Design a binder for this molecule. Sequence first.
Ligand SMILES: Cc1cnn(C[C@H]2C[NH2+][C@H](C)CN2CC(=O)N2CC(C)(C)c3cnc(Cc4ccccc4)cc32)c1
Ligand code: NA
Ligand SMILES: [Zn+2]
Length: 106
Amino acid sequence: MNFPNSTNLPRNPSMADYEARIFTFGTWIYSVNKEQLARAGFYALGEGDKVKCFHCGGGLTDWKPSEDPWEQHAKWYPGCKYLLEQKGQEYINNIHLTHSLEECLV
Ligand SMILES: Cc1cnn(C[C@H]2C[NH2+][C@H](C)CN2CC(=O)N2CC(C)(C)c3cnc(Cc4ccccc4)cc32)c1
Ligand code: NA
Ligand SMILES: [Zn+2]
């Protein structure tokens, strides 16, 4: 995998628009909602349920129905400027705390 983009400039500007991201999914069979994915910056690659964020370039796969796009975006790509713009560092910290705590109980 490539290093995550942490600048304020998106790595894939062709996918900066919500509607452009939506088109990439086509008929979507997966447990996670495509519009929810698009809203969280993600577009489909067309193999299984692999998605990439247009901004950080961050890739995710194998979506369980309990996995939220924004939460996962924060878990795995915490430097993403798009994430920070949309959700705020307050949200981002609670998510980190929550995940880093879930381990304790597990
Ligand atoms: C394989 C893998 C590792 N962890 N998980 C658990 C899942 C659970 N569902 C969640 C929705 C996401 N999880 C993490 C995940 O998806 N990560 C974590 C990471 C960053 C190490 C990683 C690397 N590379 C892939 C592959 C890839 C996907 C898009 C484009 C190109 C390659 C996935 C992935 C799956
Ligand atoms: Na498809
Ligand atoms: Zn991102």
